[PDB]
Amino acid sequence: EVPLPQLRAYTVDASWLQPMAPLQIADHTWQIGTEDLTALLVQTPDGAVLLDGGMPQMASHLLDNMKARGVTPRDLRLILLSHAHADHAGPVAELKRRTGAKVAANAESAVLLARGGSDDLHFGDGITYPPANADRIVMDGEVITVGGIVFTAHFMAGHTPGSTAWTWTDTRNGKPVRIAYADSLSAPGYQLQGNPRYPHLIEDYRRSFATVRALPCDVLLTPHPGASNWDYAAGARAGAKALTCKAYADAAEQKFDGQLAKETAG
Amino acid sequence: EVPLPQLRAYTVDASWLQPMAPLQIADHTWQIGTEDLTALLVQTPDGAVLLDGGMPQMASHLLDNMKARGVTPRDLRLILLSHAHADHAGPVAELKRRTGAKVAANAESAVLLARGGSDDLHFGDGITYPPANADRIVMDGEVITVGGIVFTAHFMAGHTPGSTAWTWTDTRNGKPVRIAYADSLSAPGYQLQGNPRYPHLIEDYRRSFATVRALPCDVLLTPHPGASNWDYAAGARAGAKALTCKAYADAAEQKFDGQLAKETAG
Amino acid sequence: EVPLPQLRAYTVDASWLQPMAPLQIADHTWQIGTEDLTALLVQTPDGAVLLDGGMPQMASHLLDNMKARGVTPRDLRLILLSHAHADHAGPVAELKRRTGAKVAANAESAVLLARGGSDDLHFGDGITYPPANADRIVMDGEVITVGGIVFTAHFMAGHTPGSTAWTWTDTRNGKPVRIAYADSLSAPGYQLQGNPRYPHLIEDYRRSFATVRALPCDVLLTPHPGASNWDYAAGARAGAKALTCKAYADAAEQKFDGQLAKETAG
Amino acid sequence: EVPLPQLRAYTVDASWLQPMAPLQIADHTWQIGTEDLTALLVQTPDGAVLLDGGMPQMASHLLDNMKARGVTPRDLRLILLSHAHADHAGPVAELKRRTGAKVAANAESAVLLARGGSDDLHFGDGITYPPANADRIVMDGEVITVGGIVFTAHFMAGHTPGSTAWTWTDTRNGKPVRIAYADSLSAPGYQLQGNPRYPHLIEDYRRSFATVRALPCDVLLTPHPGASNWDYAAGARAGAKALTCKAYADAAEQKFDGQLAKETAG
Ligand SMILES: O=C(O)[C@H]1CS[C@@H]2CS[C@@H](CS)N12
Ligand SMILES: O=C(O)[C@H]1CS[C@@H]2CS[C@@H](CS)N12
Ligand SMILES: O=C(O)[C@H]1CS[C@@H]2CS[C@@H](CS)N12
Ligand SMILES: O=C(O)[C@H]1CS[C@@H]2CS[C@@H](CS)N12
Ligand SMILES: [Zn+2]
Ligand SMILES: [Zn+2]
Ligand SMILES: [Zn+2]
Ligand SMILES: [Zn+2]
Ligand SMILES: [Zn+2]
Ligand SMILES: [Zn+2]
């Protein structure tokens, strides 16, 4: 007879796990994650900020890249998140143990983070990671300032209820660069209509397309770089093909409309 | 070049995942887990108690067996744990969502349960499961009474800091049966001496052998049935070869002493 | 010289603390709180629901009234909240310890409840109460069904970020009665404009007036009965003067507009 | 008729709330609390440690004294606790919000801290304070090192289940000074014998007298300075009359034995 199935690990494309050296985006902002998962380090005269960490097994690589940038574990002050799925918040618990970093997130992201991504609205317990506690709860439009760099939260619920875009202004060539780190606008395998766990899912996505379209946005970055047409392995041309926030939102909405139509037809 | 390794799932022997029908231990007490993982259902005129749940994927099987016993989800009042590792507390979060059950545990087990077994003193993040919150914190020697059956906590730290034996008195053939559900006394791959995460590990194990030896114990049961020589697949003879609590403690101590000697020699 | 001030207790009008016997609202719905704080008991063939509990010292009185209604501690299945301030969620922790009740709330209310109302956006640590954990997180528009009575969540952020209206359909004289338990729409001493802890406060209140105006609403009830012109001490005429949801929302908006004007002038 | 009683604030002797300037204990160790509540600042070349904070309203005074010592909010790295009652852990939540500090505590202290001192084994909800989360859980005998100063945990359960002595070695006049910060050994109004919430209370106190007696202890400090005969207002003679750890333990045991006898006679 037949035993219950073994637990299945959350496995991902190899490029999501391929370490890369730090790639500079602007004067204080660096990509320090893997080829296909974004983890942004922002360095200030008063400590560093990390936006996303990628997968759980990326913690040591992140710490190595911070060190290469001159950031010791004590210097990391703040972790911000796009959303609290395993492939973006994965190493947060371990980073908190090994650095001085505290986590700021909205309430939805905080409760999902605290249960390690378990009981996901769409994925059940299939994508769990080590749970972590948020140290600060942020509201929509709230700002957090570190070493004089101001980060603004823009809620864009849909991909998760707590999905957030973070914006800040850096510099390049003596000119301001308004960076928008916009969260995922995908709905991979989601039941969109009449979802009892997320009854206003479609309304939230539509509002979120509008939110992303209107962001202050000289340079768009996304948790999965391919979503904004970044190629982190392409060196000096890594961001050459990057979408505007308007184009990113429009593409996501067109895809979403197609998915809605297929769902009705399914 | 080389990507970071994929996450590895916690996989176990097939017999640990082999469903079995309920096996009666005494008038109110049943084994309802798998062939090689204990999950005890105690049925009272005022609701049911579950002691351990086994692996995370066992939740639905547990609920099926409760139903077979006449226990609806609303009837399950209380979950108790031997210790909060993935193969004994695995389905606790899901059971809480799907039943009326509340969890009672000591502080050490509660904090480990709340982080889903992550940052384990010995296993790091290798054995995580969905986190759950305890509803009641118990102290050593504290009693919990359900439908007139009295459960007593006996702390036996070592295998985990929060390892607990639970004892209660059931009946069989009109005579009282003092049941001892004693936790694991193993230290699988543990650094025993000079462990910076558990400096008093050896003292705690020695105290725990003494605690187990002295338990009220007409019938011994253990989270892994093989540890007390139970054979759940052997029907009417399932408990025939079961160890006494004294014999279980003595065997565990002799094994532990051997492991200490090998560690010194390693 | 001068010692730091003593801690100050959260004290309230005596009528907020004046016990009353259960007052029937509809066939399954009763007011069981105090003269001036609402606590609604909904009794079903499969257990009871409590909506709000009032102040922390009201726990035993609530349990007394449940008993008078035939509801034992084991029979209380679910606690819902308007918002997680001390005068409405006060006894929740104790009720959870003393009954079978589990708490369902949105993420904002859950995180405020979990810190016992401390670090309030407007009141700091002035109104703390015993913290409690939510057992279930609900989304806007989500339904919860108990004994066949269906409760629908309607988020109406403003008074707190997690402020919620709950609606359900009961019966009276063989006819359906659509009950709306709408949260507070007050902003007592709040900084409304340019509040760094709540930057979209005004937008949220405006949306919430519209939400309340549109609720299914044969009978309106509010956490403070005076807000909807209920008089719990007036017996058979207790609800005679009750506002419609439309009138409640309109009055709240007119008051809010006046407060905005005074703030600008202050 | 009669309303339920108003909530009662936890009020204390004025001297417990009387601010004092920093008082040096050894080369890196300062008393920065109030005249009658200990809060120890330990300053290292790599950040500062705070042991206890006193009452909730003491947060700003603590931050003022740290500033006077040259410790900015970012420089405070670690908070340790004797035990998690309101008059020693009171300001911890606020300190975490306003500084870079993370909390390390044992599991018992962590769960009590997380519920803001509510549901106390002896005092119920009479002494609540803002809840805080621990960032690191420590085991008995575990060390924590900051800027080269090594702090060792010594569990001494009784006054609370999580009561802890902290020891470290500082210097004075070129010679090592072994400082013991030993927790309270009082049992104020406690039911000692047959306490269903703390069945092994007497055994734990007896073990704790023995633990305190044996501590490395050139200088004893206690959360209430009077308990070790410190007089913080007495300047150069503040510690002149301080008890040894042996004398402190002996006095506490003699008092405890008297209380046991009175309880039997009561
Ligand atoms: O990649 C995907 O299709 C889905 C399957 S499980 C995981 C959660 S949402 C997305 C990662 S952002 N991902
Ligand atoms: O079975 C074992 O050797 C170890 C490896 S990881 C997991 C945690 S302790 C034991 C299950 S009780 N087990
Ligand atoms: O009644 C009030 O004015 C304020 C002062 S503090 C407390 C929190 S909001 C309202 C109770 S709903 N209340
Ligand atoms: O001071 C006291 O008698 C008691 C009454 S309530 C509070 C908790 S234990 C002690 C403060 S350490 N104290
Ligand atoms: Zn995702
Ligand atoms: Zn992703
Ligand atoms: Zn184990
Ligand atoms: Zn096991
Ligand atoms: Zn309120
Ligand atoms: Zn109120």
Ligand SMILES: [Zn+2]
């Ligand atoms: Zn105390």
Ligand SMILES: [Zn+2]
């Ligand atoms: Zn004290």
